[PDB]
Write a protein that binds this ligand. Structure first.
Ligand SMILES: [Zn+2]
Ligand SMILES: [Zn+2]
Ligand SMILES: [Zn+2]
Lengths: 239, 232
């Protein structure tokens, strides 16, 4: 119902993320190419494949790595609307073009348009919510999340508490990256990736670092039991 | 019915574990003192509070540590019979001891110790611990034991090891000694290495490498002549 949810073209300008992840917008958003050899775009009918150049580059960079490891094709979910803003339906952030949802399934064969248009969600989390379905969990999903968490531009990765629990178990020695993995409601089929504010973006609000430690103990366990600049775009009918 | 189960007094002589944990006996077994300020003894009526001097010293060393951290009282379960021999299947060489995964802060009474109330810590589906019954002291209790240089293996339900794997953090090498096994939903089975001078004692190989929190832990969620002589 908002102008943000109605515009179909990005606001032309210098790429600028404005506000915070959960209250803001983005001017000069870039558009993720639809055709790629390393990834595919889901639910393009929602028109949520826009974002900051940094988000686009991270996707291209992450998808190229997965491909070169022969793990499959990346499936890209919600990014941001043409000018950012709150989603009518879906996660609550993604407002500044720095958040991207990625399916926790790596097809080894490209999906068809119909499949991408209406994805068949693969519920990983157990029926009670404390573990992952062992017959669906693949080593590639572990790798996918670890690779993402290792990018210097990524600050946080939100997944269901059960998924992080399966990660805590498989991490072994190399586990500082686990700190970037944060538990949250749902996120049973997608991992939510959030990037740091772009260096040159002056009206972007960053988040403190996450708690210290892998976070695999008590905190995880607790789970098992408008910016003037944006408003201006409205006040002047630019959206 | 076997002789082992009738004998009431340990065979006098120098302490000697004979055979292996699941098939052997022990000469010169020591008795865990009933009265202690750090631990109490469950089910004394079974007369299973006997074992090698090393086991008794381990229980005292551990109980003392737990007490000095103000964590509570250690409750000692099955150890070994007066002379060892064939609950669990091992415990035959006085080198195994079952410890209740519960640390009361107020000493139990005789009746409680005689009719223990097993505190099932594992969830109904068996894949995790009852969050409301799992305390931080239970974690510390298993860690302290695993860190003992004389301990080689500690058997617990898979779900309990799973919990330990989550709480461990960076200091986790000891997890290698924790081993998954059926049951053990209320007891942690502590096994000691063979005593140096018990030449007829047979040790086990070292446990697989790594913390074992991976593929292995997950797969679970889906008569020695000298002994035949004591029997006369
Ligand atoms: Zn999201
Ligand atoms: Zn469960
Ligand atoms: Zn036992």
């Amino acid at each position: 119902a908002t102008p943000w949810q109605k515009i179909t073209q990005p606001v032309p300008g210098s790429a600028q993320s404005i506000g915070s992840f959960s209250n803001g917008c983005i001017v000069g958003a870039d558009t993720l190419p639809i055709q790629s050899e390393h990834y595919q775009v889901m639910r393009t009918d929602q028109r949520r494949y826009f974002g900051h150049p940094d988000l686009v580059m991270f996707i291209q960079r992450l998808s190229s790595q997965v491909s070169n490891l022969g793990m499959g094709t990346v499936l890209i979910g919600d990014m941001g609307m043409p000018a950012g803003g709150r989603f009518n339906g879906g996660h609550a952030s993604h407002q500044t073009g720095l958040d991207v949802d990625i399916f926790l399934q790596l097809p080894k064969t490209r999906w068809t348009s119909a499949q991408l248009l209406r994805p068949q969600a693969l519920d990983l989390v157990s029926r009670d919510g404390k573990h992952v379905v062992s017959t669906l969990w693949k080593p590639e999903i572990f790798s996918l999340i670890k690779l993402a968490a290792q990018d210097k531009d990524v600050t946080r990765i939100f997944v269901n508490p059960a998924i992080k629990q399966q990660l805590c178990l498989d991490a072994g020695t190399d586990r500082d990256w686990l700190r970037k993995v944060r538990p949250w409601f749902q996120h049973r089929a997608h991992m939510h990736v959030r990037l740091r504010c772009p260096a040159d973006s002056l009206e972007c609000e960053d988040q403190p670092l996450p708690p210290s430690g892998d976070g695999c103990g008590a905190e995880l366990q607790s789970w098992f039991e408008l910016p003037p600049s944006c408003q201006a775009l409205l006040d002047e009918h630019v959206i």
